Amino acid sequence: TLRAAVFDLDGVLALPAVFGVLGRTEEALALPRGLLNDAFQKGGPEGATTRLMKGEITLSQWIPLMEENCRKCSETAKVCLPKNFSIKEIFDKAISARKINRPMLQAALMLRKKGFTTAILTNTWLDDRAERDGLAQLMCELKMHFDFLIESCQVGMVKPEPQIYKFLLDTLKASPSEVVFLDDIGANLKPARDLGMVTILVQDTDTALKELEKVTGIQLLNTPAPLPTSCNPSDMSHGYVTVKPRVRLHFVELGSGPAVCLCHGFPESWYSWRYQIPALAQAGYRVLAMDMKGYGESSAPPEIEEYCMEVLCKEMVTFLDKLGLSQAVFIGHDWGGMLVWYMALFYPERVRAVASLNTPFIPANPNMSPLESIKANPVFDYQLYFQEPGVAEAELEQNLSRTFKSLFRASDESVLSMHKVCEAGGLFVNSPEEPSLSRMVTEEEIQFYVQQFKKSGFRGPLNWYRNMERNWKWACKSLGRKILIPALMVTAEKDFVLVPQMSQHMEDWIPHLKRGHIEDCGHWTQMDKPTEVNQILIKWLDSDAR
Amino acid sequence: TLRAAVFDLDGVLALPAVFGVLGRTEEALALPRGLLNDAFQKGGPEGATTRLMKGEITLSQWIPLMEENCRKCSETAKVCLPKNFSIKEIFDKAISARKINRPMLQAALMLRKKGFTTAILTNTWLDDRAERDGLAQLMCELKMHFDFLIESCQVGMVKPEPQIYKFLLDTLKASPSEVVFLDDIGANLKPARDLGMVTILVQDTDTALKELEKVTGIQLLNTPAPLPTSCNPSDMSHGYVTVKPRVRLHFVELGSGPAVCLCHGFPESWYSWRYQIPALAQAGYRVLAMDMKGYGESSAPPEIEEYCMEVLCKEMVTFLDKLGLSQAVFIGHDWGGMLVWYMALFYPERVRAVASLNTPFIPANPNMSPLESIKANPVFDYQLYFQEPGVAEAELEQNLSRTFKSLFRASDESVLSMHKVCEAGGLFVNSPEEPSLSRMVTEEEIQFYVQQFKKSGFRGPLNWYRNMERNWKWACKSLGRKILIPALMVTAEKDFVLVPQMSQHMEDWIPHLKRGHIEDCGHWTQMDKPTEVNQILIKWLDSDAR
Numbered sequence A, B: 001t002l003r004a005a006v007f008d009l010d011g012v013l014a015l016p017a018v019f020g021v022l023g024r025t026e027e028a029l030a031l032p033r034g035l036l037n038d039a040f041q042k043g044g045p046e047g048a049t050t051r052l053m054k055g056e057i058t059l060s061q062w063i064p065l066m067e068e069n070c071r072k073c074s075e076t077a078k079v080c081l082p083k084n085f086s087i088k089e090i091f092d093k094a095i096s097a098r099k100i101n102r103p104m105l106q107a108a109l110m111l112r113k114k115g116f117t118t119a120i121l122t123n124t125w126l127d128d129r130a131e132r133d134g135l136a137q138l139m140c141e142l143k144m145h146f147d148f149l150i151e152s153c154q155v156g157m158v159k160p161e162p163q164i165y166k167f168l169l170d171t172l173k174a175s176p177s178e179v180v181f182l183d184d185i186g187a188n189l190k191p192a193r194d195l196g197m198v199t200i201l202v203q204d205t206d207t208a209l210k211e212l213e214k215v216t217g218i219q220l221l222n223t224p225a226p227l228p229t230s231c232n233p234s235d236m237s238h239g240y241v242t243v244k245p246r247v248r249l250h251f252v253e254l255g256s257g258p259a260v261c262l263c264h265g266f267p268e269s270w271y272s273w274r275y276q277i278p279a280l281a282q283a284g285y286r287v288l289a290m291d292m293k294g295y296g297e298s299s300a301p302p303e304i305e306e307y308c309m310e311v312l313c314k315e316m317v318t319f320l321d322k323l324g325l326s327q328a329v330f331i332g333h334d335w336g337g338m339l340v341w342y343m344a345l346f347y348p349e350r351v352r353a354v355a356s357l358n359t360p361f362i363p364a365n366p367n368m369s370p371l372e373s374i375k376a377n378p379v380f381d382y383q384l385y386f387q388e389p390g391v392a393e394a395e396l397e398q399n400l401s402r403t404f405k406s407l408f409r410a411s412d413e414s415v416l417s418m419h420k421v422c423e424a425g426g427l428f429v430n431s432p433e434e435p436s437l438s439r440m441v442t443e444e445e446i447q448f449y450v451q452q453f454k455k456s457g458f459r460g461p462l463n464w465y466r467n468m469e470r471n472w473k474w475a476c477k478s479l480g481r482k483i484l485i486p487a488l489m490v491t492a493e494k495d496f497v498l499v500p501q502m503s504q505h506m507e508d509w510i511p512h513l514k515r516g517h518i519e520d521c522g523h524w525t526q527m528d529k530p531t532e533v534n535q536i537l538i539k540w541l542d543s544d545a546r
C-alpha cells in the first residue's frame, strides 16, 4: 500500500518547464531543432550542466560554459547564432515565467492531508543571479506544503543516478512499493520504476492526476474548492513587546513588505486570523497578528480602565514605536474593528490604511449616555450582561470547550440567540452542554482556544466592554473629525449582531470609504468565509495600501 | 536646581520652522509681507488653526479653511493670489524639508544622560495627508530619546494657554523652578516664565545651547563626538522561532525595509550589535539581530555535531522559511562572519548580500587536515585549547564578570596575548583576577553578558570550534564555486587574531568584493568602533543591498 508521494519540480509542480523554453527559443530564433537542448546536455555525466546540478558550480559560473557549448553546437550544425544571443536573458525569462502548477500542488496537499509523506525531488542549481529572489520565493511557497525537499545541488547527486533514489528512500523511511513518483522526464522515472516504485510520466496534469487518484484510491480531481493555508502555532515566529511595566503584547509574524497589523475580536486570539496570515504574507505583506491585551500570551491586568480604547490605542502606538514601525495597515474584526477605527481617528499618521470586518464606524452621540444607546437595540443586550464583573466570567470559564464550540458556529448552526441574555440569565442557558462540532472548526482548533484561555480567562477580554462611559467621553473629542486615510468596511450578510445595515451612514464620516460584502457569512468572518476575506483584503491592500 | 528640560519641536528640535516657510513663500510669490502668516493665525483662539492644534479637526480638513482665510486676507490687502496657489503643496514641501536639529537633540541626549527628565512640548496636528509617513518617521526618531512627548492635538490644549503648562508640570512631576523650557516663539515662552520656569528664546541653536549650558552647568557645546544610539534589552521586540524539535532561535527585531540578519561571534550575543540595530533601522532596514545557536535565549543542545556549519546554515535557512522571508542580507562578525560566507556559498538564493567583519573567506585546503592548518599559525593556538571538551568551559565559566571584562577590551587595553594558550594552560593564566573596566563597555553592559551566559554557559558556544573535520569536508564541496552575490569584507587594523592580511587573496574567490577598513580597531569591532561600522555598513547597504 502507498504511503509516500514524490513530485519533481520542473514540468510537474512548476509550469512551464525550462526544457520547453529551450525548444521555444529555438523556434523563435529559427535555429536548428534541438540545438539549445543539445548544448544544454553536452558532455552528459561529465558536462557543465551535471556539475551545475550537483552543486560543483553556481548558475552564474555555468552561463559562459553553456554559451561555449552553444557556439560548439552551432559550428557543427554549420549555422550562425544571432548577434544578440544571450543565455542569461533566455534563462532569466524562463525562470521568471515558471509558475506553481496549482492543481498539482492541490493534489499533493490532499495526499498529505490523508496521511501521505510528501517530498519534492529536484535536479536544481545554486542560483546566484541578480534576479535569484523570484526562484527563492517560488521555492519558499512550494516547500512549506511538503515533508521533504531534496535538491540535487545540495546532495551532490542527480537524477537519473541510482544513488539519489536510494537517498530519497532513506529520507522517506519507506520501501519502494510504498512510493508514487511523478516526473515529466522518462529517463528520470526509469530508476524509480526499476527499484519497484509506482511511477507516473507527467505530460498534461489532468491525466497524471487521474493516474495518481487511480493508484492512491484518494479523490484528487473534481474535488471541492479547498480552504486557504492555515497556521501551525508551533511553526510561527512569535514576537513579544513590553509596551509598559506590567504590559507585554504577543504577536505572530510572517512575511516581508508593508506592515499589516491584524486585530481580533471577542473572545478570540491571533489564531482567528490563521487563514489570512499565510495568504497576506504570500501577497507581499509583513503580517503582525496580535494577541490583543487580555488575551493568549499578551498580558492580562485585572483593572477595568486598562482596557479603555484610549489606553488600548496608546499601547498599540507604543508597540509600533518599539518595533521601529512608523506605520502599519490596521485590520480589525469585532472589538479589533472598533480599535482600528479609533487608531485612524486619533493616530492617522501611524495608520497606513484601515479595514474593519463587521464592526461599523458610528460616531458617539454626545446627547445620549452609551448605556442608554445600548438599551435601545435588543441585539446589544449581551453587552449589558457583560457589565457586572464576575457574572459573564463564571459562565464563560465554567467549561471552555463548551464556550468555544457554542460561540464558533456558521450562520445555519447557531445555538445562541443573543437576545434576552440578561432575562435568560446567560449566553448558554438555552444551549446544549455538549455542542456538536461546527463545520468551521476542528476539535484541535477548538482545543487551541481552550489552551489559550486557561492562562487569563475572560476578565481582561470582558473588560473591553466595561469602559462605555470612558470610551464615549474620549470618542466625543473626535466628533469634528472625518476619516480621510484609505479605509475599507467589510460587511457580513448573516452577522445578526453586527448587521450590515448598521454601517449604512459611514460615508458621512469616511467619504472615500471602500466596501466589501460577504454573502452567507456569520459573525466569525475570518473562519466562516476565509477564501473571500482573503480575496477582499488582498485586492484592497494592493490597490490602497501599496 | 534644574532637573527637567523641555523642548519645542518646530524651530527647536526640527529645522527649518514652518513659520519661516510661510514668509519664504510670501517672498517667492511676491505676496504682501505677512499675508500667509496672518491667514494662518486668523481668528486667533477661535480660528481654524487653533481647532487644528487642539485636535478638533485633522490637517486635511484644515487645508480648505486655510485656503478661505488666504482669499479673505488677499481680498482685504487688495491683491490677487496666483492662479496656481496651493496650501497643500506649500505645507507638503515645508513638512518634507524639515529635518532634526542634530546639535539640539545631542544637547537633550546629554542632559538626559546626566539625570535630567526630558520632554517635547509641541503645538502639532493630526496628519492624515497622503504623505503623512515622513512626519510619522521624524516623530519616531525624535520621541525615543525623550521621557515625554506632549502633543497639543492629543491633549486638546495649546501653547500659550496656561493649562498646557500646568499639564506639562504635572507630567514632569517637577516644580517650575526645576524646569528649563526652550521655545522659538516668545509668546509661548511667556507663560512658562510667568510660572517661574527658566526659559530660552531659541533663534540660532549655538546661542540657545550657550544659554542652556550656562544655566544647567553641563557642557553641551564643543563636546566630544557622541557614540551611536544603543539598545535597552527590555525595550526591544523579542522574537522566537522553533527551527526543529529541540532548537529555538531568539532574535531582536527593529525597523522596516529589506531584512538584515546580524550574526555575532564568540563568545557574544545579539547585544554585541547594540550600536548597529538603531542605526540600521533608522537607515531603512528591518534588523534581525540573532542570539546564535548555543547563546542567550536561543537553544543550546550539548552535542558537538549540533554546531557544525552545515547544520547551523540549514537552521538559518529554516529560520527564514518560518518567518516567511525569501532573503535577508547576512552580516556576520568572527564565527558569525564564517557562517555568513558559508550561507553565500551554499544558499545564494536566500542571501540578498553578504558582509563580514574581520573574518576573511579562505577556501578549505583539500590536501591538509584543518588541525594541521590551525597548528601552522601561532595566532590560532587558542582554537587547539578549545578542542578538549570541558577544559575551556571550566576557565570561562569560573568567573563570568572576569571572563567578559578580560575579553572585551580595546587594542591598547589588552590583558590577553592569544599565543601559547595551551602551553600557559588557559586564556586568563597571565590575566588579573579583577580586570579594570575597558573604555568600550560599562559595568551594566558587562552584567548583561554575565546574565546571558548564566543560562547555558560556554559548551554550545565552544562546540562551534569542535567541528573542524566536519566543516572541512563540507567546505571542500564548495571548492569549484565563487561568491558572485554582493559582498563586503571589513578589516580591523588591530585585530591581532583575525589580521587584515589574512583577507588578501579573497578577490580570487569573490571578484566583485567591496571592502571597508577600520584603523585603530581591535577584535570587538562593533563596540570598538561603532560610528565607523555604522557608516561602512549603511553606505554598502544603500548601494549594494537596496
Ligand SMILES: Oc1ccc(Cl)cc1-c1ccno1
Pocket: A266, A267, A382, A407, A416, A427, A496, A497, A498, A523
Ligand atoms: O458577536 C458576538 C459578540 C460576542 C459574543 Cl460572546 C458572541 C457574538 C456572536 C455573534 C454570533 N454568534 O456569537
Ligand SMILES: Oc1ccc(Cl)cc1-c1ccno1
Pocket: B266, B267, B382, B407, B416, B427, B496, B497, B498, B523
Ligand atoms: O578573537 C578572539 C576569539 C576568541 C576569543 Cl576567546 C578571544 C578573541 C580575541 C581577540 C582579541 N581579544 O580576544
